[PDB]
Design a protein around this nucleic acid. Sequence first.
RNA 1: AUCCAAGGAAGGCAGCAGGCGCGCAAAUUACCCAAUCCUAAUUCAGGGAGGUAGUGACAAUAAAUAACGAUACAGGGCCCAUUCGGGUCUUGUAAUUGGAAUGAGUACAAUGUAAAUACCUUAACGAGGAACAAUUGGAGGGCAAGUCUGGUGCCAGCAGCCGC
Lengths: 134, 144, 48, 185, 260, 197
Amino acid sequence: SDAVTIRTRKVISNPLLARKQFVVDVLHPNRANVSKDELREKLAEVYKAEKDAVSVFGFRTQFGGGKSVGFGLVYNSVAEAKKFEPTYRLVRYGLAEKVEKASRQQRKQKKNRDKKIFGTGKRLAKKVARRNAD
Amino acid sequence: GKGKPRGLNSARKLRVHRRNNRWAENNYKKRLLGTAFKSSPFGGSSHAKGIVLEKLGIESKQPNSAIRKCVRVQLIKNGKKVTAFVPNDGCLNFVDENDEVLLAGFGRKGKAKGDIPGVRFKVVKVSGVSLLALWKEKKEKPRS
Amino acid sequence: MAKVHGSLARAEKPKKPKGRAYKRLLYTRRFVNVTLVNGKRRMNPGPS
Amino acid sequence: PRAPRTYSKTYSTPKRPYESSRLDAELKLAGEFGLKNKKEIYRISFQLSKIRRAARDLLTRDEKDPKRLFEGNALIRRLVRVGVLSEDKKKLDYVLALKVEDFLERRLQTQVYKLGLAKSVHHARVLITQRHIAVGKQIVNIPSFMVRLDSEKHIDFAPTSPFGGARPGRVARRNAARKAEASGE
Amino acid sequence: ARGPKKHLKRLAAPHHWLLDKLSGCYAPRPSAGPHKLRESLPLIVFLRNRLKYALNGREVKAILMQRHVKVDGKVRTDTTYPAGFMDVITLDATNENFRLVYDVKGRFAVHRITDEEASYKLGKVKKVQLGKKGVPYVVTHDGRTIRYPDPNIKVNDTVKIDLASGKITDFIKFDAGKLVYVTGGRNLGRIGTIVHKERHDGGFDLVHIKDSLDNTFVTRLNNVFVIGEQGKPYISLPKGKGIKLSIAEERDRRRAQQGL
Amino acid sequence: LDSIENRKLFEGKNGAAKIITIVPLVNDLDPLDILYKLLKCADDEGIMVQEVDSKRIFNVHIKKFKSNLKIIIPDMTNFLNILDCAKVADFVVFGLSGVQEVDEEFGEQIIRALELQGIASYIGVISNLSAVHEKEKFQLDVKQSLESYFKHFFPSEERVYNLEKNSDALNVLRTLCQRLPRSINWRDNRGYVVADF
RNA sequence: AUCCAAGGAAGGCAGCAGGCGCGCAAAUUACCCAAUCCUAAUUCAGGGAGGUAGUGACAAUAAAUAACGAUACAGGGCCCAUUCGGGUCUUGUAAUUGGAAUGAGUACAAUGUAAAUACCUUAACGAGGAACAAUUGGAGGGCAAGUCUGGUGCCAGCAGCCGC
């Protein structure tokens, strides 16, 4: 019964960010919220670009369902997509890696422990190791 | 002409006349002298806490003969000794002495005809506990 | 009196309906069922 | 420290609480229209109060004034769009004889029953709140929708709803499954 | 304050930026530069809010760090650079040009410019004076200081400046019966012809202007800017032509542009 | 001055006797479970090892808040012993199992009897909230059920704390180390000794 | 007011969290720089500014706690009543019966978001609802509501006002 129809509103070519930005309408009768990956594939094949040069985000389904609205970007290459996109959306797309970090309290206390150290500290390390050995 | 000036350059006499005649009101004189901030036992607040010193069998004689159930309290914020009424408990079984009590105001105007008093305050809570839900048996009172 | 530990809602004469059905019931009880007692609409009468 | 987000009240408490004629009239309105609160009447009273204040403070200005003609035409046209004010009454004088029932008749609550889509006004509110009724394509489940006039030829059942479209509901196919199992059993 | 401020809260923004009041909490405080804080327009607002090219704040930074945007011939790298009135914004990779002209409602509007018109720029002379080693100079509305003008140039004269060399091409002296745009105040954004000059010594001067539809209005001398002649502006004017309309006329025009 | 002078019984460095009586109210709840989930958030586990073998009356100095606690666990069959342990306490800890109900014939009678003989400052404590399904979306329902139940008998508290988390357990430990208890009138008029030797 | 080997040495939470005291009176020692902006040598680093979530009946908006039938029985009305009975309604009940509708709640998934939680969607479950149980204050007058029953009448003609 269903046929997922995709429309693009507000189509703007931005050569300054080397891309095209538009509004993604999805008419999906009898479907719940046609996912981002399928939209990336179908916008890559409509606009004849790489899937890695296609981004969609900010979706929301209307009341009652059957229609969803979001925002859509398509770059001119994969490398321009790599150099212009925010890193969180690259991690969402598998086109980069989640940079594993320490917690923020940890690094603040790390910085403030470093602030009590003037120099390399290996001089102080030798002197405290000697005095403990004393 | 109605005993007051009506000249067009006479706003000064009119407003000095109003500021002199507004001291004859009641709420104005209590309000701008800081009466509640000095002598009222709550010190100008809607509630207060205190410690029960006594239970009192006050008597209302005429024309209604009743045994009023009251409590003499010493308030915590002031060091002020205030008697207050406690409702709905014939036994005062939720109240002992040396308990802490949240009091509010209470507008009974007692009569002069038979020396019946209207004390100013009702008991709202004893030992943290809603006195209503005690009397309506919805909570239990920790007894210290 | 005191309700038991099992307050987990997740996992006699009949009741009065609530809200708008109660207003429907009152509209039947005052203006559909006209009860003229001695020339007046008497609500809550005793044995008479 | 942000923009303090604005809001307002929408109903108004009446001045005297116990007034037998008012209680009877309000309850007649609730019975004719299937309400639940007195606040649902007080809302319409408050809105009609603001409209009457706008009207009677535009009446004091003389005609052929741009403010009067401008805001008057805006108000009158906005009332005609929802079918509260009729076509002939497009003057500032007739919005003051406009009463509460004229508003209360223009609800989705009322218009579902009046188009012959429900058996009762109460059944009309029920079919609203159980997500069965669409206006054009968008499904509405607030009875206070206040149908604009041009939206009258769009009220129908939803393509989601079993009355208007797709597969029968939970109880229906549950009973069908029990019938089919018991016929198999 | 114990020193100069560095922030600008979002309610304290100039209202003619049309910033929403629930996006965030602040507005971009414009830097020091060619225009007044109150009447400037920083580059972040012109890229994001009006041309829709940037979605975020850092996309503005990404565009400006690729040297696409020129303000009056020179490349600017500031997020909050005060682009103001009569200024020229050039997008090379887009191949577009913009002149910052007020709309009739008093805010800056998008306004496309040919390459020939983008070469020059007008400016109201705000002071003429005689600087060191006796050289005369003019100082314009944007802070440009030009040495060796024409001696006929007095105060309030509009001077045409060719953006390549930054020299005085030609000028208009402030005479009655010239074409005049209005810079500040209530009547902002209107185009008319000055009737005469009312003169109050020791105080503020006033100017009566009469528009294309013979409505008359009065501003101070500070808010005046000369453009050209009757029907001959030196620049291309935006749509509406600085003609103030009543609300009923605007409403009828809006519903007259609605015929399915 | 008077408020500080009334803390001279409770410098936990020399004459401080902050007596805590830990009563589980459900027999599927261990009192040493509660004691260990308390003293583990103090991070001095030597006390936890030295409290194991065979004792009932513990004399513990916490050097963090520098307080002197005295822990008593009642005999959970002698109801008279439960009464006698709670009538000497400065604090009363109420254990609530998240799975088995408080007994109407055993646990409720403990609650009502101790309450009607007079309780000082008390704490409600859950130790088996994670013995319910591991998602907190259902553990908070059990926690709110226990809070609303404990509100009936004791309205002075509205947080019945979880010992599963460091947060609430450290809160309870801070309460027991610092906070001054309400006084029970009849016993403080006659003087009372707890005695070791 | 803190540490101390007694010689000396450190201190300012009317910043974000949090504690004591105080009082009728007021929240988490959470996550994040993705927004909004700001600072720097500066696109990248930093930001308890700020954003996000928890707690939150401070206020404010919208509005679930049921809706249809058939039966009977009692009526009432509409016209045909010469009488029966011919249908149209509308009540009341009968914890009588029938087939329906749907979210609270649970939850594959997807959307959402820095990551999440929640919302909007949605597979699969989810009610005769004798308990997915609506309360708070009243029933002399002011002021809507008792000409009702029992106990009280030694704590009781009583208590915003008048009071019987």
